[PDB]
Amino acid sequence: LTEGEDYLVLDKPIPQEQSGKIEVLEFFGYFCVHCHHFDPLLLKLGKALPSDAYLRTEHVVWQPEMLGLARMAAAVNLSGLKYQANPAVFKAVYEQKIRLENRSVAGKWALSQKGFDGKKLMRAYDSPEAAAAALKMQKLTEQYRIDSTPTVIVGGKYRVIFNNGFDGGVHTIKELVAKVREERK
């Protein structure tokens, strides 16, 4: 690991979801194009990370309209429908046939879907928790200058530099988790 080469020090730390464990936070967008409609980095990290590390994701909000995409991400997470629903969400965003950022369009879309409880997803979508979470994602994007997807932050402090491709990324993340663990002694 080298400062300025492999990683960067955040000027203000991002408060972790859970204390005691080491957060690995990914900022993402549903406009990130993946060959199987899921992020291969999240899948790899889920298995390669040590036992005391956990994964967090936030949808990036770059334009005011994008609060709609962030609200979808919050709905999915909060409904507990990540693996049943996200693939269909990526695909809808990829095709660009409907403005999924719009609540009523999102609702009509969700209810017509064959592969998951769209009613459960929409219940989470119209709950105060999901609207709040969507706005928090905007605050996070702005407050911490997230201008790039994916961006990975470890233990709230260290921002990955993807200087060596995919696999160099997992290695950097793993070393950063070991850095955070040791420093919090």
SS3 125: helix
Domain with 134 in it? 1-185
Q: What is the CATH number of the domain that holds 157?
A: 3.40.30.10
Q: Would you say 27 and 58 are in contact if contact means Cβ atoms under 8 Å apart?
A: yes
Resolution (A): 2.3
Question: Residue 141 belongs to what H/E stretch?
Answer: helix 128-143
Residue indicated by tokens 């470890």: 154
> Parallel, antiparallel, or unpaired: how do β-strands 22-28 and 151-154 relate?
antiparallel
- The number of distinct structural domains making up the chain is 1
